[PDB]
Nucleic acid binder design. Structure first.
Ligand SMILES: [Mg+2]
Length: 155
RNA sequence: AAGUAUAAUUUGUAAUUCUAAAGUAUAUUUAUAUUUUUAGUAGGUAAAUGAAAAGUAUAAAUGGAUAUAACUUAAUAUU
């Protein structure tokens, strides 16, 4: 929908340099060439997908000294991305913020091995999302019979 | 993620339908009784090629040689 979408797109401003050692442009290519391909899905169906809009500079993309164009107020200065360790639980998220297929989390819990302590909570919230899916129709089937997938799909 | 989604309704929302529990009672059987596993009496036996001691006469007054075609005939009675 065309509602709640930016009708303009300002640019990035790079405030301070995250490094003092300037890269050779071959380093700027060899890191970028590493980025253009990424993995999608984590299970038996897992497919490499090529990534659109891979930045010119990998070293300076998100990790410090860049001011985001997410500013809102008048006196709001574009927020400068700080150092990594000052952002809480980021290293802990990198472990656990990833697509977790249910089967796969489950097997980890059974083997009593979790990459992060949090993947308990990652599992518990998946189950609750699934069962909700079950609990919704059971409030909908009550009021009127709703038959799953008998209608013609598309045109 | 701090249970927001496979519906109905609406131009699009919103509001309102709805928001998961379910057991015992009635959902124990009949048997006896009836149409065909038997004897007793008759009565050769296990199923289809008739019987005449009276003309086959010495026999002459009470001898049954009464032994029997359902479609073509002949005559007669009917409806
Ligand atoms: Mg109500």
């Amino acid at each position: 929908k065309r509602t709640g979408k930016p009708a303009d797109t300002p640019d990035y401003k790079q405030v301070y340099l995250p490094y003092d050692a300037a890269p050779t442009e071959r380093e700027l290519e060899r890191e970028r060439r590493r980025f253009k391909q990424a993995y999608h899905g984590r299970m038996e169906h897992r497919k490499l997908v090529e990534v659109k809009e891979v930045p010119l500079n990998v070293y300076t993309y998100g990790k410090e000294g860049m001011s985001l164009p997410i500013a809102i107020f008048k006196d709001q200065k574009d927020p400068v991305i700080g150092p990594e360790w000052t952002y809480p639980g980021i290293y802990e998220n990198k472990i656990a913020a990833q697509h977790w297929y249910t089967e796969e989390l489950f097997d980890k819990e059974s083997k009593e091995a979790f990459e992060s302590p949090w993947q308990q909570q990652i599992l518990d919230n998946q189950v609750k999302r699934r069962m909700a899916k079950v609990m919704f129709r059971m409030r909908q089937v009550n009021m009127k019979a709703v038959d799953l997938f008998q209608k013609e799909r598309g045109s």
